[PDB]
């Protein structure tokens, strides 16, 4: 499916952002936050983790 | 049935587990860790975030 190629991209974006956060980048902005579909939900979860890490150190 | 239907399930599982961690479930087990494809990579990053939380509070 040629359409599948477009779907694969946002997954790479969320993965790359998550790596930046875990390595100690508490300022990294997570993308796809405003999405309402399954991808938007996954983005929101990554943001929630970022908040905990900041508060954990703050 | 539709092969594409299987794709949605791991996404819901990963999102749900991430929510569990963020709410204060530091011992939550992240799923699909054994996968090496894009889904497995996303699972790995979530495991990193969970560890940082446990380290941050330690």
Task: Walk me through what this model shows.
- 2 copies of one chain form a homodimer.
- Chain A is mainly alpha-helical and 58 residues long.
- Chain A has one domain: Orthogonal Bundle (Helicase, Ruva Protein, domain 3).
- The first copy, chain A, contains 2 helices and no strands.
- In chain A, helix 1 runs parallel beside helix 2.
- The longest helix of chain A is centred in the first third of the chain and has 20 residues.
- Chains A and B meet through helix 1 and helix 2 of A and helix 1 and helix 2 of B.
List the helices and strands and how they pair.
The structure is a homodimer of 58-residue chains.
Chain A (H helix, E strand, L loop, with lengths): L2 H20 L15 H20 L1
Distance N to C terminus of chain A: 46 Å
Bulk shape of chain A: elongated
**Oligomeric state as shown:** homodimer
Largest interface: A-B, 22 and 22 residues
Give a quick rundown of the structure.
By secondary structure, chain A is an all-alpha fold. Chain A has one domain: HAMP domain in histidine kinase (Helicase, Ruva Protein, domain 3). Chain A is 69% helix and 0% strand.
């Amino acid at each position: 499916g040629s359409h599948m190629s477009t779907i694969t991209r946002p997954i790479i974006e969320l993965s790359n952002t998550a790596d930046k956060i875990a390595e100690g980048n508490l300022e990294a902005e997570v993308p796809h936050q405003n999405r309402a579909d399954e991808i938007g939900i996954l983005a929101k979860s990554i943001e929630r983790l970022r908040r905990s890490l900041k508060v954990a150190m703050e």
